[PDB]
Each structure stands twice: as structure tokens, then as C-alpha cells.
From a paper:
Here we identify the bacterial esterases, GloB and [name], that activate carboxy ester prodrugs in [name]. To establish the structural basis for [name] and GloB substrate specificity and enable future structure-guided prodrug therapeutic design, we solved the three-dimensional structures of both [name] [name] and GloB. [name] and GloB have distinct ester substrate specificities, which are supported by the structures of their active sites. Additionally, the finding that mutation in either [name] or gloB is sufficient to confer POM-HEX resistance suggests that the two enzymes may work in concert to bioconvert POM-HEX into HEX.
Conversely, [name] orthologs hydrolyze p-nitrophenyl esters of short-chain fatty acids (C2–C6) and are thought to mediate detoxification of cellular formaldehyde. A single dimer of [name] is observable in the asymmetric unit, matching the apparent molecular weight of [name] as observed via size-exclusion chromatography. The overall fold of [name] is characteristic of the α/β-hydrolase fold. Six parallel β-strands and one anti-parallel β-strand pair form a central eight stranded β-sheet, which is surrounded by α-helices. One monomer of [name] has electron density for a single magnesium ion, whereas the second monomer has two magnesium ions present. All structures display strong structural conservation including the positioning of the prototypic serine hydrolase catalytic triad: Ser120, Asp204, and His233 ([name]). However, SaFrmB and human esterase D differ notably in the solvent-accessible surface around the active site, suggesting the potential for distinct substrate utilization, primarily driven by differential positioning of the cap domain. Using Autodock Vina, we modeled the highest catalytic efficiency substrate of [name], 1O, onto the active site of [name]. The pocket directly next to the oxyanion hole is relatively narrow, suggesting that steric hindrance explains the poor activity of [name] against branched substrates. The active site pocket extends and opens significantly after passing by the oxyanion hole, supporting the capacity of [name] to hydrolyze substrates that contain large steric groups distant from the carbonyl carbon, such as 11O.
Residue numbers in the entry:
A (entry chain B): -2 to 251
B (entry chain A): -8 to 164, 176 to 251
Write the structure that this text describes.
């Protein structure tokens, strides 16, 4: 089992500026044989939080080692703070992550089947994960929010830069009951009979978001949305996300 | 889903384990951002592709740093593949007789995993110094794979291999362009269109004049472009600009 480690710098049409991506691509024998078709890989979209970039999971966890064991391609895009609340509709975080998805599935040998595509992330990346699970449920078979932001008030506790923080403060009164509120997205997804990915939700018991995580899964239980929840000792850091992403990858592929 | 306006390149660094040499190797790939790559509802448009071979004083980043090749390739919507063929890697490939195998492996791998045209008319090869020697060898033994070949300031023997502080054991431890040329002409093999370049102050200028004289006598067509320049990236920057324009037109 071998992996190709890829760094990609490209101009993003959605954001309108350059963005970096990390891609780890398992080596498959079909990729070296010019006479056979490529065998498409299972693929995880992995979303970092506000103190990270496209290199942090590589540096602060052993994710590549876990992915190599399970022959899992992983896509780690850079996410700028301004993507979440400073951009116009159509040019925001949501659109950008879907652009990354489309681009890497066009240019790399990644499966396009729902059963072969997963999404995961922590903190604001866990907010991203649950938003994509509830709006792009036909795209991802499984979703793993880690130490996730589920509530509007959580947003004021985070490490936003100055320009993004000003947009967060200025639009806070507009989050609840909109497409930016995970609870609203959840209620809507059920109503439109949308596919919801299988959910594995994880949080450490010392995390400042732990109780809001319990509140979210309690609501899931009350509206009969299936999920698995795993907790244990751990805080809001990569010592926990290293352990959690190892467990998540095993769960995803099996 | 939004698609690029105008011409942009993706800059890609790839590290992969090579089945051929059983070692990890770096590649640089510059890949045009074609609109089809951002539209999930269309088939990808395969791109014209250059395999570019650096010399023994370089690595897979040197062309990026010491020329403006990416700017030239962006203008002409050309994908460029720059494998590491550095001095230690080449020494291992030459000893194990795996150099052809490695470059062919790189070719096959990038055409499998990236949206690169597999048609001969869309595939080119180029390189300078020992990479020009390599370009000539691939032109004469793999003429069916490349429509065009551009040797820059080529050497015609692998003596530069010895220009490292090898120990005596390593020093002591069909690769002739002219033999390969005779063979290709005798057997009526396909030879790519040839653009041969060398600067007039290069120590290798006379060796290149000797080679094109032999191509004339043996009736192999070519274009030869020369001018002021020495054996350096000031020359290769200008030469690869010209080569890329020639390749894609
Ligand atoms: Mg973070
Ligand atoms: Mg965060
Ligand atoms: Mg050389």
C-alpha cells in the first residue's frame, strides 16, 4: 500500500482567487497500466476549522497513514475565513467546497458514486459537514461531524479574523431559522424527504462544544434521524481529532 | 458551478512511489484549468501534454524557478510534466537499466490519473543537456508516442554522469544517439518532428552542428535554431518559450 501526496495551487472561479488543496491518492495498479481503465477510488472530503489550513491535518495527525491502510483518497481544501460570511451568494463556502468536489472528481480517478463518497470535519468544518449532509445528501453516503458547531451562538466563540468576525457579528441576527442554521436545515431535509447520509458524530467530553453536541443529538433522536455518537476524554484539539479521524476512517470504509 | 474565465494553471507537486525503481520520486505538473474540469455535467477535454526532462544539475523544481515556463504554458494551454531525473536518481536508473522504464512509467501514470490526451499528435517531449540526450533517445525509440521532440543544448554521451564525487567502486561501475538514429532510419521507424536548439557560445554547439549535419546526410527532417546563448537557464528560458509556441502550432 502506497500513497501519492499531492499539493495543488489553482485559481478558484468561485472565490475568485488562488486556493491550495492537499490530495492524498492511493496508488492502484490500474494507474500504471495504460491498457486498463482506472479503478475509481473511495473519497473523503475533509474540512478543517478556523485555526488550520490545507496542511494542518497532515502535520498534526497521522491521517495519511490511516488513509493508506484503508485505500481512501482524501481531499483537504484550504478554507479562508472570508468564505463563510464575507462573500456574495454563489461565491461562498458552500459553493467553494462543491467546486473543489467537482474539480477533483473531474481531474483525478475518484469515484463519483454516492456510496464511495464521504465528508467529515471539525469545529467550523463540522458545521460544514452537517450543512453538506443536509443539503447534498444525494452526494455523500456518510458524514462525520467532529466537535462540530451546531448553533448560532457558538459562532461568536470562535477564532475569526477581524473582517470575518465583523460579518459574523453583523449577520448573527439573521442566522436562526435560515439555511445557515443546522437545525433549520435538519427540519427542511426531513420535510423534503431528502436522503440524509449515515451520521457518525464525535466530540470529546472536555470540549467547550460538548453540551451543544449533546443537545443536537438529542434533537436528532426526537425527530427520528439515525446516527451514531461516540464520545470519550478529549478536548478541542488535534490530539483528539487524530484519534477521532482514525476511528472515522475505519467506520467510513467498512 | 462556476468555471474559469480566461487562462489559469494549476501548479501541482506530486510525490509517489515508483514501481519501476522501488523508490519515492517527485514530479511537478502544471495543468491548465480547462472549463470542462469544473463542470460536472460534461466530459473532460484531454489536454496537449509536454514531457520535459531537466539536466543533471537540476531537479523537478528548477524549470519552475529559473524560467517562466509556466507563463508560456498558460498562454498556450499546455500541460507540462517535469519528473525528477536528478543526478543520484539518474545514476540508479542508468545502473539498473531502468531509465526508459521510469520515464515511460511517469508518462503512463500521469495520463492515467490526469486529463491528458493520449493521442500522439497531442504529446511532445523536450529537455536540455542530459535531458536533451534523453529527448533524442525517446524520439528515436518511442517515436510512435510523441509527435514532436525538442532537444535543447543536448549532450551526445552520458559522461556528465561521472561529474559527482563517486567512490572508486561507483566510478568503476544502443545508448548512442547515432546508433539509435541509424537503427530508426534503417528500420523505417516513426521519428517525431524535430526542433533542435543550441546557443552559439555553448561548449556543445559543435556537437549539435555535427548531429544536424548527420541528420541532413541521413535524410531525417528537422529544424535547427541557434543564436547567442550558453549552457544555462538564461538560454533555456528563451528556448523553451520558443519551443512551446512551436509545439502547439
Ligand atoms: Mg482548527
Ligand atoms: Mg473552528
Ligand atoms: Mg546534464
Amino acid at each position: 500500500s502506497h500513497m501519492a501526496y499531492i499539493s495543488l495551487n489553482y485559481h478558484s472561479p468561485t472565490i475568485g482567487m488562488h486556493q491550495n488543496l492537499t490530495v492524498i491518492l492511493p496508488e492502484d495498479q490500474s494507474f500504471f497500466n495504460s491498457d486498463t481503465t482506472v479503478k475509481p477510488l473511495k473519497t473523503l472530503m475533509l474540512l478543517h476549522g478556523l485555526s488550520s489550513d490545507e496542511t494542518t491535518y497532515m502535520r498534526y495527525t497521522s491521517i495519511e497513514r490511516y488513509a493508506n491502510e484503508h485505500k481512501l483518497a482524501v481531499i483537504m481544501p484550504n478554507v479562508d475565513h472570508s468564505a463563510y460570511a464575507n462573500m456574495a451568494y454563489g461565491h461562498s463556502y458552500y459553493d467553494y467546497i462543491l467546486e473543489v468536489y467537482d474539480y477533483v472528481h473531474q481531474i483525478f480517478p475518484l469515484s463519483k458514486k454516492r456510496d464511495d463518497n464521504f465528508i467529515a470535519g471539525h469545529s467550523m468544518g463540522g458545521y460544514g459537514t452537517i450543512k453538506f449532509a443536509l443539503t447534498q445528501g444525494d452526494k455523500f453516503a456518510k458524514a462525520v461531524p467532529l466537535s462540530a458547531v451546531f448553533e448560532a451562538q457558538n459562532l461568536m466563540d470562535l477564532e475569526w479574523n477581524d473582517f470575518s468576525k465583523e460579518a459574523i457579528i453583523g449577520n448573527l441576527s439573521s442566522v436562526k431559522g435560515t439555511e445557515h442554521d443546522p437545525y433549520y436545515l435538519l427540519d427542511k431535509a426531513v420535510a423534503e424527504d431528502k436522503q440524509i447520509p449515515k451520521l457518525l458524530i464525535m466530540c470529546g467530553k472536555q470540549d467547550f462544544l460538548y453540551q451543544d453536541n449533546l443537545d443536537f443529538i438529542d434533537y436528532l433522536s426526537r425527530i427520528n434521524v439515525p446516527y451514531q455518537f461516540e464520545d470519550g476524554p478529549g478536548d478541542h484539539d488535534y490530539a483528539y481529532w487524530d484519534q477521532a479521524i482514525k476511528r472515522a476512517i475505519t467506520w467510513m470504509v467498512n
